[PDB]
């Protein structure tokens, strides 16, 4: 019957999970991966300069 | 294309003196802190030969060859000039395809 205003927070279709001390696998709206896990499996030149024996 | 222009075109220098051949790049050839310039020597009647890599370090090459320079302009310094130095000298950059060479400088 009356005008109203609501306070609320964001949500989305994210499936990204994150861990904490008290809880594991916490789905979260946004997360940043900070661990690199891939390499090119090759020995390469370093900044335009290796001696391969 | 990084146009490489050598100067002078032909250089006649007295025996036992100093030859000073220059190279000039249209844009820089110089990132990662190193210069990606190379000097090549073509003694007449045979294939070119590698003298200097990344603008300063000698490849069995006598010390008479001074590789110097940074950025847009470089210089191959031959001093003292010996007898078996008649050749045409080339600078070529590797900083960015397509690999481009200089006009070349003939030494007398």
């Amino acid at each position: 019957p009356g005008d109203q205003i609501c306070i609320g927070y964001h949500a989305n279709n994210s499936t990204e999970q994150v861990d904490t001390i008290m809880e594991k696998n916490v789905t979260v709206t946004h997360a940043q991966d900070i661990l690199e896990k891939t390499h090119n499996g090759k020995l390469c030149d370093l900044n335009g300069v290796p001696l391969i024996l | 294309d990084i146009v490489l222009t050598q100067s002078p075109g032909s250089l006649t220098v007295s025996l036992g003196q100093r030859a000073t051949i220059s190279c000039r790049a249209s844009e820089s050839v110089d990132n990662f802190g190193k210069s990606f310039m190379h000097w090549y020597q073509q003694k007449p009647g045979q294939s070119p030969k590698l003298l200097i890599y990344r603008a300063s370090n000698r490849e069995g090459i006598p010390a008479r060859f001074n590789g110097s320079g940074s950025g847009t302009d470089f210089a191959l310094t031959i001093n003292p000039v010996e007898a078996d130095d008649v050749a045409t000298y080339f600078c070529q950059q590797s900083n960015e395809d397509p690999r481009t060479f200089g006009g070349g400088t003939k030494l007398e």
């Binding site: 609501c6 306070i7 609320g8 964001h10 | -």
Partner: protein, 172 residues
Amino acid sequence: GLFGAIAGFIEGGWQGMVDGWYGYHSNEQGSGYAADKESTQKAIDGVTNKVNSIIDKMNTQFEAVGREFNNLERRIENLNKQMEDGFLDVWTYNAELLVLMENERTLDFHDSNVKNLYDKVRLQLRDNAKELGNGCFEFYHKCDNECMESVKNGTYDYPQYSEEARLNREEI
């Protein structure tokens, strides 16, 4: 969480609000979502500085070096290995723990920003509105779009609506 807002007295987030993390209406002119730019930017700055601080604190981390030893240097070989693994294990703990600890604080940080936003509105409205108890305040007066905007930017003129609010409270 720690502050009772996110998944607390406000039971659920809004897929509908998309221009921010925290925000707000429903009147005669119509309804719609809007993000509180101020509290959102504060949180963004806080989390961004946090992420950048974590990555910064780790620049002086241990870096393993190849070292070789012969058959009669087995002791210092092993010492060297224990030293390397030793630091690798310490710094792995430090990175893992730091992330776990600051994650927990981050979730509670958002919870706190929300609870503060709710309180920001509540402390403005006072008896000029009714606490529904779900993050919503039902007004005791007419709140047009411009009035909605005053609540959202902290310029609510409480006494302007005080009388029409008080009268509406008392027939109730």
